[PDB]
Amino acid sequence: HHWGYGKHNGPEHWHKDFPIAKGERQSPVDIDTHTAKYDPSLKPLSVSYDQATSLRILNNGHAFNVEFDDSQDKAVLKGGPLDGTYRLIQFHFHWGSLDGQGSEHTVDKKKYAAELHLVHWNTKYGDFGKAVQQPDGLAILGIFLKVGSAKPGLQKVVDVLDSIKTKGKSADFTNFDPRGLLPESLDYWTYPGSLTTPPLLECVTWIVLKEPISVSSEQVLKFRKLNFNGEGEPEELMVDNWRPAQPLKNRQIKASFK
Numbered sequence: 001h002h003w004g005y006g007k008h009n010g011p012e013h014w015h016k017d018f019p020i021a022k023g024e025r026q027s028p029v030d031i032d033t034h035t036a037k038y039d040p041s042l043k044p045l046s047v048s049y050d051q052a053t054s055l056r057i058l059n060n061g062h063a064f065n066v067e068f069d070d071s072q073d074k075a076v077l078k079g080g081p082l083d084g085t086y087r088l089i090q091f092h093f094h095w096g097s098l099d100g101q102g103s104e105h106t107v108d109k110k111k112y113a114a115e116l117h118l119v120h121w122n123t124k125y126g127d128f129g130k131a132v133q134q135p136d137g138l139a140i141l142g143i144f145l146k147v148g149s150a151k152p153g154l155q156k157v158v159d160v161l162d163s164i165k166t167k168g169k170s171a172d173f174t175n176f177d178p179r180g181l182l183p184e185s186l187d188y189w190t191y192p193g194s195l196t197t198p199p200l201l202e203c204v205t206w207i208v209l210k211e212p213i214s215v216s217s218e219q220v221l222k223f224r225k226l227n228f229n230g231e232g233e234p235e236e237l238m239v240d241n242w243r244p245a246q247p248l249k250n251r252q253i254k255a256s257f258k
């Protein structure tokens, strides 16, 4: 009876195994754009992905992860609210069964069709497992997806999904350039939060871009053909793998822009 996104093991159940689910800095949250404070002390974000080395794509039963070589400073996030250097380890998405839902963060209660998470860890902690135990261990760059025109840079991802339909399947995925998934503007909101899947650890500096990327209906439809289940198990479509907004509590969301 592992955690998941179903009726009997979904987000409202997670707290039983993971009490931090009801903690003080849980994610995602609603971003109230009128209450977010412009912060002039924020530096411009630095996304250096030119030397990124993608390795593999994995269906892990709750999403698919595009994994990167993080044994060197190759694809790094710096600046903005961050002190030091954070290395890209993987990216993944959350999406809905319908275009009107799927994102984890919301903007003035608006849900997007999906949300991309580029997950980075603080190099001062040596590796990902140590980093998740620190309050400043991770930096996750969140990017909203809306349905409209296709995103050409996403197509290589969509086309390999057939080969990893079910839980536990992986495929070689080299030479993928994550720069093709970024919107034009790097304007962002930022706040301290958590992983949005168990273990829900409170180790994340969230950086959520204001500008969504557009993907096509055909692209998101292919996300929705994935399976939560393993091969030879009853088919359950991998859809609605998002956690809803959690209480902001004692936090202020800061904006890099006015």
Ligand SMILES: [Zn+2]
Residues within 6 Å of the ligand: 092, 093, 094, 117, 196
């Ligand atoms: Zn995520």
